[PDB]
Amino acid sequence: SLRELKVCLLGDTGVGKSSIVWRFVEDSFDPNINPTIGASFMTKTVQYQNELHKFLIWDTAGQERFRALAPMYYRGSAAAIIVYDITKEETFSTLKNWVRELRQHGPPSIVVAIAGNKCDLTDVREVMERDAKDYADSIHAIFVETSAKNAININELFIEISRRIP
Numbered sequence: 001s002l003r004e005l006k007v008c009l010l011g012d013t014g015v016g017k018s019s020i021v022w023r024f025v026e027d028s029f030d031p032n033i034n035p036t037i038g039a040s041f042m043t044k045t046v047q048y049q050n051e052l053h054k055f056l057i058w059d060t061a062g063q064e065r066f067r068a069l070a071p072m073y074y075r076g077s078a079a080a081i082i083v084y085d086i087t088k089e090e091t092f093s094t095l096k097n098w099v100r101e102l103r104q105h106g107p108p109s110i111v112v113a114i115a116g117n118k119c120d121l122t123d124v125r126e127v128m129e130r131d132a133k134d135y136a137d138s139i140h141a142i143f144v145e146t147s148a149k150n151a152i153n154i155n156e157l158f159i160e161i162s163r164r165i166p
């Protein structure tokens, strides 16, 4: 048996959406990765208990000219991963806007996950873990501080999704 799970990544440009997906699927990291144009699609199948979860992963362009396309991506998604950058408070401040948009226009029972990415960059941290954790908890979302660079909580993010899908 095999279970298809559409997952979309949402967030401001530069937060590491593509790097998260590349690390999960291709097990690689590129400091020189270019901004996404349109969307990138990758897939990985993982054993969860007695089933196989085939993640159909939509890596969306964060650049504002692509925002209008977002509804196309979250439609039919089993989960949404909203990514911010722990070194830029602006991307966290903005988190509520992404959540709002997913509340207002997304599927009724989507699994929401919040990823605080670039957690390897601790010296220049701007978003305290506790504050982002508190927020994720308040909306009953999955939360992890991730690093695509160091492979911190990348698999764990998708494991939490596997646990919480119906």
Ligand SMILES: Nc1nc2c(ncn2[C@@H]2O[C@H](COP(=O)(O)OP(=O)(O)NP(=O)(O)O)[C@@H](O)[C@H]2O)c(=O)[nH]1
Pocket (backbone or CB within 6 Å): 011, 012, 013, 014, 015, 016, 017, 018, 019, 020, 030, 031, 032, 033, 034, 035, 036, 037, 060, 061, 062, 063, 117, 118, 119, 120, 121, 146, 147, 148, 149, 150
């Ligand atoms: N140190 C560190 N750098 C990271 C991490 N994830 C991504 N980066 C870097 O951050 C920059 C932006 O990454 P990228 O994956 O392109 O972000 P994005 O959210 O996909 N941007 P876009 O929306 O424009 O496609 C790149 O220089 C990349 O190497 C991380 O976990 N740690």
Ligand SMILES: [Mg+2]
Pocket (backbone or CB within 6 Å): 017, 018, 019, 034, 035, 036, 059, 060, 061, 062
């Ligand atoms: Mg990208």
